[PDB]
Design a protein around this ligand. Structure first.
Ligand code: HEM
Ligand code: HEM
Ligand code: HEM
Ligand SMILES: [O]
Ligand SMILES: [O]
Ligand SMILES: [O]
Lengths: 682, 679, 323
């Protein structure tokens, strides 16, 4: 149990009487009043201590990544990696370290939709025996900007306009695209956010990236440059934008429920921890500066080397005390790892320490149960708001004769202390510049786009088309066009069509045809269909429900989560048509006999909105999901104009439908149903 | 061990390596720099996590009673008091409850002197098995004001002037005496603060009071009116003002050191808890309203009934985490006790809960180790800054089928719940007024002044003369005299002399000659002299130090703390003359042969300020202490014009001096040395 | 008037009726009660709004230098110093700039005595036309330690023992002299603190120092190493320790009252701003490293150059809001 250390602070209220926060049993359902219908007394200490705690429940949301969810788990190392790092948690085969991971979006506030289009956070804490080590990552390997001092500008431009606070959780407005086109470094991450990475199917279907080049350091002090990767064992998978939008309204907790259900049902998700390793003397040897956070390292140049695997198997007990209160920091570093001169990472180190003082209203936030290490804290820090400990050492200073030198200094050779990479040097003038090696803002965006499938490329273009069409200012849109044209003339011309702007002329300085692996989502089927959702649309009339039950039981044998849907909650029905939507499922199957609710009287009922079963089937097909119908229910396929032998469409008896649906869930999205530019011309 | 429950939060750094606040061994004595003589790097996470915690160490001090100190201990009940209270901590003979007590001044800020003249706080927390019960009291049984809405007015007027923040920890300025005379209710507590209660010898030599009338409630709801009293087993003792002034500069920590040393040396101080009990129908029977916090109940009408004893025997381990962080509340009430309609108490219940939000910057301050009860907390409160627990009940609301009714409601008949006194009634118009029964502001100040000894009365008069002479405004000084003349014409006349104002003619409306017991300090000797301090003035020349060591060993047999003083720290010397002052001791005795440092070359040395041994003896004599000299050292007493004929002065051989000094310490202060108006 | 810009936030209550913090005239000398001898009602918004502000009056004292006092004034440049610095406030003869100065102790808390033996702060703000420039200095030209990461160790050692919080505003205890003897860099400032600098007669009778070497830079990038000096026009003066001990008890506000009285009586104190100017290539040429804050540069090697004069002529109107 990864939460084992947290059980000492867990409070069980069952079987007990109500109390105040300072003890004493009470009743707290009536205010103390001066007379039968009199005014409430100031001396009602019970009322005041109850309402004051309610009044003070909220803490500030995170300044970025305010919307997200998390879970506990275990990380297991696959070997003794002392040959590359002194990091304790990687020092032996099958060594296990408790983790907590929080996934998130970036721009939206606390109550915004999971399926907004956005970069996604992927923050992992290792509770190692030599301190907490945090990898505060994203599901995209490059970031918008090259210097941390520009972070407020980026975030202000993509967060709501400061006059009306419109729009929520979205880059589709003037200020954001004004910034993307005025700061061309941002276009690489923008392309990633405009792809499937911006609308993933779940937290469990994302890769993770530390983005920055870090350093692994051995006991003798030798170092190597390193990139952190998390590779999902569930496979990468993404939605389509028109589906993500409906899902934002139908279930804004789609992603956090996904992770919770997967863990509750015993299908804990896993990611493998992998690294790219680079010699120090090759930091600038691959066509870009490895200090540049707007660049990723093509796997053709440095392949991923798996070090271990992380499994998230325990949900939190109290979301606020654990998920909301946890405080990640890239400054949470340990012996065996070091920073680099990445100007974006450099400022992060200051920013995450500082912002905790705003979120937690004091300096003792590492004493919170979810932030505490398991390795012990011994120093001369004292006092501060909410000090939860009572220190014994009264000589709280160093050096000291009176405390005998304890707590004692630890460094590279004594006490396994942290040490900066010994060979690191500084050379040159103090400057407020960026290295000229950071100047190329277009080559890698072109590289990313080249490496996507044709329909995947169309998704990127259609996302940009959707986003840029919200920009009111004409010049901003033309500025966007000029910047896009430096990535690819074809992308600019296809985006320009939606904008009503003239197709720009080629500017080939950065054009190229190179491609790289690992970057696509839709060119690979899932390695497993466990936890994937199947909506079975049935009816309470006739014998349809009995068949849906058998259809459900066999589908569950393969590890799928099946929801039987009908007019009302008859025996065996999991959900009503009124409460059902196609966004909640990865495949839709119409049970035999349920074709009655797709036409005629059966489709017009007071118990669900008009056309709901037809709409669920239409949404699922148009959003590329595997859809099916058993036996006579093929008439439902007919009523929305879907043909039986289309790709990802399955009609027949129960068993062939079951096999066809499960095969289609591996494909996940059938991209034959999405038009590409040039298809419609006569 | 009263601190037993605090064991699990203690952190031991012995033999450990230095770490960050998130773990990981580090060194933290060098900043990370870019080159040999280079600038510090932002990426030095070690530096910023160490300095950030230092930068954020301070929390706001208490809005009042900022200066103070405390200790842990045990309360033991003397009996089963269920016939008067349902309170669990008083429900069985020999039942023990851990306590923590904080003593304080009122006006001064965190770093002000202990021996400022002020009302003194005396706050006790009982960690009962049915919740935390606080009696947030003072060492004076009455308060300045009758309605809690006036507390900011009182406190602003006493605290430093808002333009220059002058003066520190003192009532001796214009605005305070402008309030005292404009708000005549304040005259009673003023007289108490102008008495020995304003300059107590130590926290251990104070009585304590809850001030307010509260209610004790039995199981069936029948209530009694109650006054809380703490009776010190050490006896009450006070300084004189001219002595307390010097001590404020020589040792501003005089009182917190005295409490620490008493516990550290195994001389734990003790207080008996006593109550005055009054039937509900006698609330207005004794010449005043018991809802009025500017009056006390004379013990002739209701004797003190002792219910148990409290002993403070454990010092804190970290001052800030324990003493500074503890959050007292009169609203911390338990089953068997209830409030009364005292308009001062009523507002306190609001203001102590509210002020913790400022001092602790969050709603979860009761989760701090020093504030946690021992009895268990089960409710549906959640979240808040610094939430330190993880609740299991996901149905955090009532009523509810899903949580099966838990946590469940508790009331008078089920669950041992708190319950307001069943018979209390409201009646009349909603009003912003005070009862006319509150209108006498002069009788009880007169009663208090009557019940003190003549020199004790003179101390009060000389306190007033000192204080009011600091008031620059002439009309305020006349306003003060006009109000003092309402209490006693003789008091006003004697104060008027110092102010150069005319003796006002008698205003006899509230004059009376009644006296009451239990309010005097100087009319009673001390029950014990254990822990009292003796400074032995000696010299490294000759054989004086040998005799001082013998003198010390015999005095220590009586539980006295003895400091041998000489020019330098020779073998057997506890303190140099340079560091010594008479304010630190309760008796001064000159060892034989030490008269050499009282005149001539022995008095002129680079090792101490000129005349310092003579100043200590002069100070000790003039401040009413027992002073003595052994053998030839009587020349030192003659050198300052003091003769052995006098009370509190002892000479002769060693055993003669020891028995005399130990006798004199019981009297403590010799009031023969203080002149009285027209004596 | 140095305080001229603060007039528009000044609030006059003479002749007015009592109000709440959200307006509306009120009375606030009686709690609202349910009957003649009744309990106070929660609906008394007047009471709660008045006590909530009182309950929330205090803010944390400064982690160091908590005990001090201040005043407003004017700094006037003696010349056009553009040949050594581009600083606007030194860019013309007779140019005037508003200032505020806070003097302080170091160790003691908010209510500690002014005549404790201690290092003393001398913090000066110039409200220049190109931003606020602060010289946050002390009355002693050298500091205890050579690296800022050791500051919590120094301060923990000098401030009271964490078990009983004894002693107040004093280095005369075990932990302080443990650190002084274990960290020998501290002995320079120690010796200064043991001299008259530790018990000055008043704030007006102190010199001031920036301690650190800084840089003055011209418009074209030319730099010189600089040490800041404040030279009191009233003369340096100190007490004796047996006197300062009694004064700590007789008047804890001795220094803040002395500064207040001098300004209010028309006797405004003044200091001249003076600098030592060192070439960059001589940073290590005078028997020590000029980056080392435990060393001062003897004036025989570099005499002072007077840049201007500052005079403190305006007391604050509200201590809390200003000082
Ligand atoms: C490669 C670049 C970056 C990555 C991968 C990244 C990732 C993240 C993630 C995953 C979180 C949420 C952690 C959680 O779930 O609690 C977060 C929060 C945050 N980030 Fe970043 N971020 C990056 C850039 C930056 C920069 C450049 C800054 C500022 C200079 C910054 C400042 C913050 C702050 C202040 C928070 C809030 C943390 C808190 O309130 O606890 N981020 N970031
Ligand atoms: C009989 C009248 C009073 C007595 C005996 C009394 C006593 C005390 C004592 C002993 C303390 C110090 C607690 C400690 O040691 O931590 C204290 C603090 C305090 N008192 Fe009073 N007081 C009285 C009246 C009032 C009134 C009328 C108010 C406001 C309406 C008030 C507001 C406060 C506040 C806000 C604190 C600070 C509490 C904290 O920050 O923990 N007091 N009082
Ligand atoms: C040459 C060395 C130093 C000098 C001349 C100096 C001077 C001062 C002065 C005069 C003040 C009070 C200003 C006021 O009246 O508000 C002050 C406060 C302070 N000092 Fe220093 N100090 C020195 C060393 C340090 C170091 C090394 C640190 C930390 C690394 C530090 C941290 C602080 C802090 C946190 C405050 C509180 C300021 C506030 O609360 O606004 N000091 N110092
Ligand atoms: O971030
Ligand atoms: O108080
Ligand atoms: O400082």
């Amino acid at each position: 149990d990864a939460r084992q250390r947290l059980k000492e602070v867990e409070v069980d209220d069952n079987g007990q009487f109500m109390t105040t926060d300072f003890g004493g049993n009470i009743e707290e359902q009536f205010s103390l009043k001066a007379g039968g219908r009199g005014s409430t007394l100031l001396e009602d200490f019970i009322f005041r201590q109850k309402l004051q705690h309610f009044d003070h429940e909220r803490i500030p949301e995170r300044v970025v990544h305010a919307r997200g969810a998390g879970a506990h788990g275990i990380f297991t190392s696959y070997g003794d990696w002392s040959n590359i790092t002194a990091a304790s948690f990687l020092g032996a085969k099958d060594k296990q370290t408790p983790v907590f991971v929080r996934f998130s979006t970036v721009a939206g506030s606390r109550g915004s939709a999971d399926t907004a289009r956005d970069v996604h956070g992927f923050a992992t804490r290792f509770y190692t025996d030599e301190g907490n080590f945090d990898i505060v990552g994203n599901n995209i390997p490059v970031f918008f900007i090259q210097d941390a001092i520009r972070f407020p500008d980026l975030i202000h431009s993509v967060k709501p306009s400061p006059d009306n606070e419109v729009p929520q959780a979205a880059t589709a407005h003037d200020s954001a695209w004004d910034f993307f086109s005025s700061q061309p470094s941002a276009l690489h991450t923008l392309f990633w956010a405009m792809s499937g990475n911006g609308i993933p199917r779940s937290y469990r279907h994302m890769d993770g990236f530390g983005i920055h080049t870090f350093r692994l350091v051995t006991e003798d002090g030798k170092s190597k440059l390193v990139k952190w990767h998390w590779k999902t064992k569930q496979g990468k998978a993404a939605l389509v934008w028109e589906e993500a939008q409906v899902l934002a309204g139908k279930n804004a907790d789609f992603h956090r429920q996904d992770l919770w259900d997967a863990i509750e049902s015993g299908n804990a998700p896993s990611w493998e921890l992998a690294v790219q390793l680079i010699d120090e003397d090759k930091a600038q040897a691959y066509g870009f500066d490895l200090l540049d956070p707007t660049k990723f390292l093509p796997e053709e140049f440095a392949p991923l080397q798996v070090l271990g695997e992380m499994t998230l198997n325990r949900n939190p007990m109290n979301y606020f005390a654990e998920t909301e209160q946890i405080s990640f920091q890239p400054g949470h570093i340990v012996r065996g790892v070091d920073f680099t001169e990445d100007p974006l990472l450099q400022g992060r180190l200051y920013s995450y320490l500082d912002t905790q003082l705003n979120r937690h209203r004091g300096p003792n936030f590492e004493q919170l149960p979810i932030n505490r290490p398991v390795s012990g804290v011994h120093n001369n820090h004292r006092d501060g708001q909410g000090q939860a400990w009572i220190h014994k050492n009264i000589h709280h200073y160093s050096p000291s004769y009176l405390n005998k030198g304890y707590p004692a200094q630890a460094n590279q050779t004594v006490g396994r202390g942290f040490f900066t990479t010994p060979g690191r040097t500084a050379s040159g003038v103090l400057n407020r510049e960026l290295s000229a090696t950071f100047d190329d803002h277009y080559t890698q965006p072109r590289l990313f786009f080249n490496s996507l499938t044709p329909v995947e490329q169309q998704f990127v273009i259609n996302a940009i088309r959707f986003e840029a069409s919200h920009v009111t200012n004409e010049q901003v849109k033309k500025n966007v066009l000029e910047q896009l044209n430096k990535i690819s003339n074809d992308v600019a011309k296809r985006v320009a069509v939606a904008l009503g702007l003239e197709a720009p002329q080629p500017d080939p300085t950065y054009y190229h045809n190179n491609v790289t692996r690992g970057v696509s989502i839709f060119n690979e089927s899932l390695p497993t269909i466990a936890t994937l959702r199947v909506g079975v649309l049935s009816t309470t009339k006739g014998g349809s429900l009995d068949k849906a039950k058998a259809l459900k039981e066999q589908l569950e044998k393969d590890g799928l989560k099946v929801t039987v849907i009908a007019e009302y909650l008859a025996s065996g029905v999991d959900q009503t048509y009124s409460a059902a939507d196609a966004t909640a499922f990865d495949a839709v199957v119409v049970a035999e006999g349920a074709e009655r609710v797709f036409s005629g009287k059966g489709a017009m009922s007071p118990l669900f909105p008009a056309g709901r079963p037809s709409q669920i089937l239409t949404d699922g097909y148009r959003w590329g999901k595997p859809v099916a119908a058993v036996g006579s229910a093929k008439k439902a396929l007919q009523s929305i104009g879907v043909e039986e032998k289309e790709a990802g469409v399955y009609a027949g008896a129960q068993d062939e439908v079951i096999k066809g649906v499960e095969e289609g869930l591996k494909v996940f999205k059938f991209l034959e149903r999405f038009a590409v530019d040039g298809d419609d011309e006569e």
